[PDB]
Structures are given as structure tokens and as C-alpha cells.
Amino acid sequence: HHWGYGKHNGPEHWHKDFPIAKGERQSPVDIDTHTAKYDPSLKPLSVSYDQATSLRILNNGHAFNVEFDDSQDKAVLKGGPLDGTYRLIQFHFHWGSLDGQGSEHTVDKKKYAAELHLVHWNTKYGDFGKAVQQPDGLAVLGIFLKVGSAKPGLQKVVDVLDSIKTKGKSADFTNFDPRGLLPESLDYWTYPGSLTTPPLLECVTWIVLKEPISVSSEQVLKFRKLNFNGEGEPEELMVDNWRPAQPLKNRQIKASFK
Ligand SMILES: [N]S(=O)(=O)[N][C]C1234B567B89%10B5%11%12B85%13B98%14B%1061B821B326B%115(B%12724)C%13%1416
């Protein structure tokens, strides 16, 4: 009886196996733009993805994951709220069954069609597994998707999804440049939170970009043809793989922009 997004194993059940689900710094959260405060102590954000080496794309039964070679300092996130250097390990999306839902973070309670998460670990901790035992182990760059014009930098991902339809399937996915998934502006909000999936670990410095990227209805429709189930099992479309907003508790959301 594994965790998932259904009625009997979804977000309202996760706390039974992962009691940190009811913790003091869970994600995602609603970003109340009027309560968010500009923070002059934030340094410029540095997203340095020129040398990123992608390896593989994987359907893990919850999302599709594009995985990178993180054995050297290549694709790194620095600056902003971060102390030190965080290495890109993978990215994935959360999306809806309909265009009106799919994001995990919300903005004044607005839900976007999807949300991209670029996951990075703090290189002072040596490896990802050690980083996830630290309160500043991870940084996730979150980017909202709205439906409108196509995102040409996404199409290579969309086009390989047919080959990883079911849980456990993977495909080679080299030479993919995640710079093509970024909006023009790096204006962002930041707060301390958690992974939004089990194990829900409270390691994450969240950096959520204000500017969404636009993707086409056809692009997102292809996300929604993936399957949660494995090959030869009854078809359950991979849709609505998002956790809703959690209590803000004793936190403040800071803005990089005035
Ligand atoms: N939405 S999230 O980025 O908080 N969680 C996604 C994960 B997938 B699995 B991979 B590993 B586990 B799960 B957790 B991070 B990485 B990424 C770790």
C-alpha cells in the first residue's frame, strides 16, 4: 500500500508513514504576495547550467524525472538566499488533469497548470544522501507553467514521453539543456520548507520564480498521457500529482524584487 495521489494513499494519508507531513516547515505553501517582503540581504541569484550533462529520463510512478551527472561541479545554483554551491541532480514536474490546477505552490491562491522543480544539493555535504540529513541540504528552483504558446525547449522532453509511459521505464536522455526551461526574469520568492513528496524531509530552501513559462496545450496534454501504473497493469493516467498548500506556521516568505 504505497503512497501516491489517490483517495486511499494521497496527501491526506501520508502522515501515517511520514509523520513529518504535519511538521513545522512543510511545502508547498501559498505565496501571499502582499505579505511577502522584499529582502535587501538577498544576493544576486546565479543559475549556471551551461555545462549540465543530462543522463536519463525515468517514470518513477509519481512523475517523469530528468537525471543529471552530478559527479563534478557542472550545473550549479548559487547566490540568492543560498550559502555556498548547490549542484543540479534532477528535475521533474507536477501537473493537473485540467489547466486550472497542477501546481503545488500557489500565488494568492492561484493554481497554475503545472510546476517544474529543479532539485539541487549542497556540495558541502558531499552527496545527496548526506545532504538530506541537513536543514540546508537542498535547494529547489520552482517554476510555474501556464498554458499558451509552446515552450520550444520543452519539446525534446515531450517527445520522449511515449517511451517511458509506465512506472519503472527509463530512456537515455543526453545533451538536454535545462536553460531552455527558464523564463526571462529570475525574480523570485524564497522560504525554508520541505520535499513535497515522501519522505517530506525538511531540508529545502525553496526559490520559486515569479514569472511563469508558457507551454502549449498540446505539450501539457502529453504529460497527461503518462501512467502511474506499471506495464501490463490497469491504466491510471498520471494526472494531479501535486500536494496542496500546507500551513505556513512560523515562516516568512521573502521577495528578491521591490
Ligand atoms: N517534489 S520534490 O522535489 O520535493 N520531491 C521529489 C523528489 B524525487 B525522489 B527524487 B528523490 B525523492 B522524490 B524527492 B526529490 B529527489 B526528487 C527526492
Ligand SMILES: [Zn+2]
Ligand atoms: Zn517536485
